[PDB]
Design an enzyme around this catalytic site. Structure first.
Site, PDB file in Angstrom:
ATOM      1  N   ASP B  25       0.799  -1.204   0.000  1.00 27.29           N
ATOM      2  CA  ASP B  25       0.000   0.000   0.000  1.00 27.29           C
ATOM      3  C   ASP B  25       0.827   1.247   0.000  1.00 27.29           C
ATOM      4  O   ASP B  25       1.267   1.658   1.052  1.00 27.29           O
ATOM      5  CB  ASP B  25      -0.833  -0.051   1.261  1.00 27.29           C
ATOM      6  N   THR B  26       0.979   1.879  -1.187  1.00 23.07           N
ATOM      7  CA  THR B  26       1.749   3.112  -1.323  1.00 23.07           C
ATOM      8  C   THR B  26       1.175   4.318  -0.586  1.00 23.07           C
ATOM      9  O   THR B  26       1.840   5.279  -0.236  1.00 23.07           O
ATOM     10  CB  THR B  26       2.040   3.422  -2.817  1.00 23.07           C
ATOM     11  N   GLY B  27      -0.110   4.253  -0.326  1.00 22.62           N
ATOM     12  CA  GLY B  27      -0.614   5.395   0.407  1.00 22.62           C
ATOM     13  C   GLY B  27      -0.480   5.270   1.902  1.00 22.62           C
ATOM     14  O   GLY B  27      -0.940   6.115   2.642  1.00 22.62           O
TER      15      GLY B  27
HETATM   16  O1  LIG Z   1     -12.078   1.984  -2.274  1.00 21.05           O
HETATM   17  C1  LIG Z   1     -12.022   2.233  -1.085  1.00 21.05           C
HETATM   18  N1  LIG Z   1     -12.914   1.737  -0.211  1.00 21.05           N
HETATM   19  C2  LIG Z   1     -14.031   0.859  -0.617  1.00 21.05           C
HETATM   20  N2  LIG Z   1     -14.871   0.242   0.239  1.00 21.05           N
HETATM   21  C3  LIG Z   1     -15.848  -0.487  -0.404  1.00 21.05           C
HETATM   22  C4  LIG Z   1     -15.800  -0.463  -1.818  1.00 21.05           C
HETATM   23  S1  LIG Z   1     -14.474   0.505  -2.220  1.00 21.05           S
HETATM   24  C5  LIG Z   1     -10.955   3.083  -0.492  1.00 21.05           C
HETATM   25  C6  LIG Z   1     -10.374   4.109  -1.260  1.00 21.05           C
HETATM   26  C7  LIG Z   1      -9.346   4.917  -0.724  1.00 21.05           C
HETATM   27  C8  LIG Z   1      -8.905   4.664   0.592  1.00 21.05           C
HETATM   28  C9  LIG Z   1      -9.484   3.618   1.356  1.00 21.05           C
HETATM   29  C10 LIG Z   1      -9.002   3.285   2.728  1.00 21.05           C
HETATM   30  N3  LIG Z   1      -7.555   3.367   2.971  1.00 21.05           N
HETATM   31  C11 LIG Z   1      -7.178   4.011   4.081  1.00 21.05           C
HETATM   32  O2  LIG Z   1      -8.007   4.172   4.957  1.00 21.05           O
HETATM   33  N4  LIG Z   1      -5.930   4.458   4.314  1.00 21.05           N
HETATM   34  C12 LIG Z   1      -5.601   4.815   5.715  1.00 21.05           C
HETATM   35  C13 LIG Z   1      -4.331   4.197   6.242  1.00 21.05           C
HETATM   36  C14 LIG Z   1      -4.023   2.832   6.009  1.00 21.05           C
HETATM   37  C15 LIG Z   1      -2.804   2.287   6.471  1.00 21.05           C
HETATM   38  C16 LIG Z   1      -1.902   3.114   7.180  1.00 21.05           C
HETATM   39  C17 LIG Z   1      -2.219   4.471   7.416  1.00 21.05           C
HETATM   40  C18 LIG Z   1      -1.273   5.314   8.213  1.00 21.05           C
HETATM   41  O3  LIG Z   1      -0.068   5.116   8.250  1.00 21.05           O
HETATM   42  N5  LIG Z   1      -1.867   6.291   8.931  1.00 21.05           N
HETATM   43  C19 LIG Z   1      -1.110   7.129   9.869  1.00 21.05           C
HETATM   44  N6  LIG Z   1      -1.640   7.921  10.805  1.00 21.05           N
HETATM   45  C20 LIG Z   1      -0.692   8.550  11.583  1.00 21.05           C
HETATM   46  C21 LIG Z   1       0.642   8.263  11.265  1.00 21.05           C
HETATM   47  S2  LIG Z   1       0.569   7.190   9.968  1.00 21.05           S
HETATM   48  C22 LIG Z   1      -3.435   5.014   6.947  1.00 21.05           C
HETATM   49  C23 LIG Z   1      -4.874   4.694   3.293  1.00 21.05           C
HETATM   50  C24 LIG Z   1      -5.146   6.032   2.580  1.00 21.05           C
HETATM   51  C25 LIG Z   1      -5.094   7.218   3.520  1.00 21.05           C
HETATM   52  C26 LIG Z   1      -3.848   7.760   3.886  1.00 21.05           C
HETATM   53  C27 LIG Z   1      -3.783   8.833   4.791  1.00 21.05           C
HETATM   54  C28 LIG Z   1      -4.977   9.352   5.321  1.00 21.05           C
HETATM   55  C29 LIG Z   1      -6.232   8.819   4.958  1.00 21.05           C
HETATM   56  C30 LIG Z   1      -6.292   7.746   4.052  1.00 21.05           C
HETATM   57  C31 LIG Z   1      -4.457   3.539   2.398  1.00 21.05           C
HETATM   58  O4  LIG Z   1      -3.283   3.964   1.779  1.00 21.05           O
HETATM   59  C32 LIG Z   1      -5.530   3.184   1.398  1.00 21.05           C
HETATM   60  O5  LIG Z   1      -5.062   2.207   0.510  1.00 21.05           O
HETATM   61  C33 LIG Z   1      -6.649   2.510   2.155  1.00 21.05           C
HETATM   62  C34 LIG Z   1      -6.181   1.289   2.992  1.00 21.05           C
HETATM   63  C35 LIG Z   1      -7.333   0.375   3.365  1.00 21.05           C
HETATM   64  C36 LIG Z   1      -8.054  -0.300   2.342  1.00 21.05           C
HETATM   65  C37 LIG Z   1      -9.158  -1.110   2.676  1.00 21.05           C
HETATM   66  C38 LIG Z   1      -9.533  -1.237   4.042  1.00 21.05           C
HETATM   67  C39 LIG Z   1      -8.806  -0.565   5.063  1.00 21.05           C
HETATM   68  C40 LIG Z   1      -7.704   0.242   4.719  1.00 21.05           C
HETATM   69  C41 LIG Z   1     -10.511   2.843   0.820  1.00 21.05           C
END
Ligand SMILES: O=C(Nc1nccs1)c1cccc(CN2C(=O)N(Cc3cccc(C(=O)Nc4nccs4)c3)[C@H](Cc3ccccc3)[C@H](O)[C@@H](O)[C@H]2Cc2ccccc2)c1
Lengths: 99, 99
Positions: B25-27
Site C-alpha cells: 500500500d503506497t498510500g
Molecule cells: O475503495 C475504497 N474503499 C471501498 N470500500 C468499499 C468499496 S471501495 C478506499 C479508497 C481509498 C482509501 C481507502 C481506505 N484506505 C485508508 O483508509 N488508508 C488509511 C491508512 C491505512 C494504512 C496506514 C495508514 C497510516 O499510516 N496512517 C497514519 N496515521 C498517523 C501516522 S501514519 C493510513 C490509506 C489512505 C489514507 C492515507 C492517509 C490518510 C487517509 C487515508 C491507504 O493507503 C488506502 O489504501 C486505504 C487502505 C485500506 C483499504 C481497505 C480497508 C482498510 C484500509 C478505501
C-alpha cells in the site's frame, strides 16, 4: 516515470478545471477526493477504510489528468483528508508496482 | 516482480512465525496488521485512515518476510480490516511505482 517510496507518492491532477495533488494509492480500490464541486449528477454511496466508513458522492465518467495522462472514470468525492487515486484509475495510467 | 493493479496487490508475509496475506500500500505511511499475537513490548499509538482514527499498538523492530524478502521495522497491530504494508517497509523491500 519511476517513483521511490521514501516520500509519499504525490502527483498533480487536474480535475473539473481545478488543480490538486493526490496520492497514488495501490491499496485503494477506488479514487476519493476531498470535497469539491464537480459538474453533474452523482449517486450517494459509502466506502470503508481504516477507521470505519464514510459516505461519498459518486460521479462517473469524469476526465482527470494525472501527470500528463488523461483518464475517465469514477471519482468519489467526500470527507477524506487526502486525495487518493485508487486502482481504478491507476490501471488506466499504466502504473505498476515493482520489486 | 512487477505487479499490475487490475487486482489487489496482495503478498504473503511471514511475521512472528505466522503466515498472512497483506496489501502493498503506497498510500500507507505505516504498516498495520490485524490483531494477532506478537511477543514483546508494544506502545499505544493512534493512526488515521479514511473513516477515522484507530488506536493501535506499535511494536518496534519486528522482522517480517514479505514475499520472502526480509525487513525489520515497526509494525502496528490493531483493528484494521485488511493487512497493510506501508511505506516504511516498502522502502526496505525496494519497492517502486512505475508509470
Ligand atoms: O475503495 C475504497 N474503499 C471501498 N470500500 C468499499 C468499496 S471501495 C478506499 C479508497 C481509498 C482509501 C481507502 C481506505 N484506505 C485508508 O483508509 N488508508 C488509511 C491508512 C491505512 C494504512 C496506514 C495508514 C497510516 O499510516 N496512517 C497514519 N496515521 C498517523 C501516522 S501514519 C493510513 C490509506 C489512505 C489514507 C492515507 C492517509 C490518510 C487517509 C487515508 C491507504 O493507503 C488506502 O489504501 C486505504 C487502505 C485500506 C483499504 C481497505 C480497508 C482498510 C484500509 C478505501
Amino acid at each position: 516515470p519511476q517513483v521511490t517510496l521514501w516520500q509519499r507518492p504525490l502527483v498533480t491532477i487536474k480535475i473539473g478545471g481545478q488543480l490538486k495533488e493526490a496520492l497514488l494509492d495501490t491499496g485503494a480500490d477506488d479514487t476519493v477526493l476531498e470535497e469539491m464541486s464537480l459538474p453533474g449528477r452523482w449517486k450517494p454511496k459509502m466506502i470503508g477504510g481504516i477507521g470505519g466508513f464514510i459516505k461519498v458522492r459518486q460521479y462517473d465518467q469524469i476526465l482527470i489528468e494525472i501527470c500528463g495522462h488523461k483518464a475517465i472514470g469514477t471519482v468519489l468525492v467526500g470527507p477524506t483528508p487526502v486525495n487518493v487515486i485508487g486502482r481504478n484509475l491507476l490501471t488506466q495510467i499504466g502504473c505498476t508496482l515493482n520489486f
